[PDB]
Structure 1
Amino acid sequence: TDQQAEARAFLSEEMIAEFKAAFDMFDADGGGDISTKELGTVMRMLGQNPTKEELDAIIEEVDEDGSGTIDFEEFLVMMVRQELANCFRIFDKNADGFIDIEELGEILRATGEHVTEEDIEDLMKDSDKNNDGRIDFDEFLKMMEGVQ
């Protein structure tokens, strides 16, 4: 039931009164339900064409109590999972797909916050896991994590 919490935070006014009237086109009698045999007739009903190997599965993973329904609870959960490649380009810069000590030196010197030839050779020691002198995109999404 923990999912339902964050789940309701995500919902803001212009899409709580909307994810309603149609989600309902799944229920039928004040008492809590909602169905799913119109799980595909409504997905697309919002612009989602799930192939049938992506229509038999959306039927094989959901619902486990027998209620044969799906409310606005464990609902908008199946409605979140269905630029970090950009920055790599504005940082990688030079096309060698990599980013070494200097460019970073640059960028870390191409910004407005004070740093040093000491603030640089310390950062390079945290994203380049494999240990080398660059940062594969792989290690480009790990350091840059948590940051805006």
Structure 2
Amino acid sequence: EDAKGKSEEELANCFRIFDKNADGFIDIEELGEILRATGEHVIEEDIEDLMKDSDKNNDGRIDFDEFLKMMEGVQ
């Protein structure tokens, strides 16, 4: 289904672009605005699922490992 190209390197940097507050980790609260900014009208019930597929250590926060994992398979 076509290739996305890009590479982990680029995504790596984006990491800091997500953590706009002293957190060093992406939590659900941050996911809200992030997704809300787009035109998908996401609701907590949906944003929560995104964290589940990522949160591999039950830390209520997506890190670089869990984050990249999702970015690779968006949606």
Relative to the length of structure 2, the TM-score reads: 0.73
Q: Which whole-Å deviations, capped at 9, do the CAs of 1:76-119 have from their partners, x for residues lacking one?
A: xxxxx991112212212214210101100110112221211211
Shift of the 147–123 alpha-carbon distance from structure 1 to 2, 3 Å rule, reads: closer
Q: Which of 57, 66, 74 is the aligned partner of 1:139?
A: 66
Larger radius of gyration: 1
Shift of the 130–114 alpha-carbon distance from structure 1 to 2, 3 Å rule, reads: same
Choose between structure 1 and 2: higher helix proportion: 2
Q: How large is the Cα RMSD of the aligned pairs? A: 8.5
Structure 1 gaps, min length 5? 1-63, 69-80
Structure with more contact order per residue of length (Cα contacts < 8 Å, sep ≥ 6): 2
Choose between structure 1 and 2: higher strand proportion: 2
Structure 2 gaps, min length 5? none
Shift of the 112–129 alpha-carbon distance from structure 1 to 2, 3 Å rule, reads: same
Identical aligned residues as a percent? 93
Between the two proteins, the alignment pairs up a number of residues equal to 73
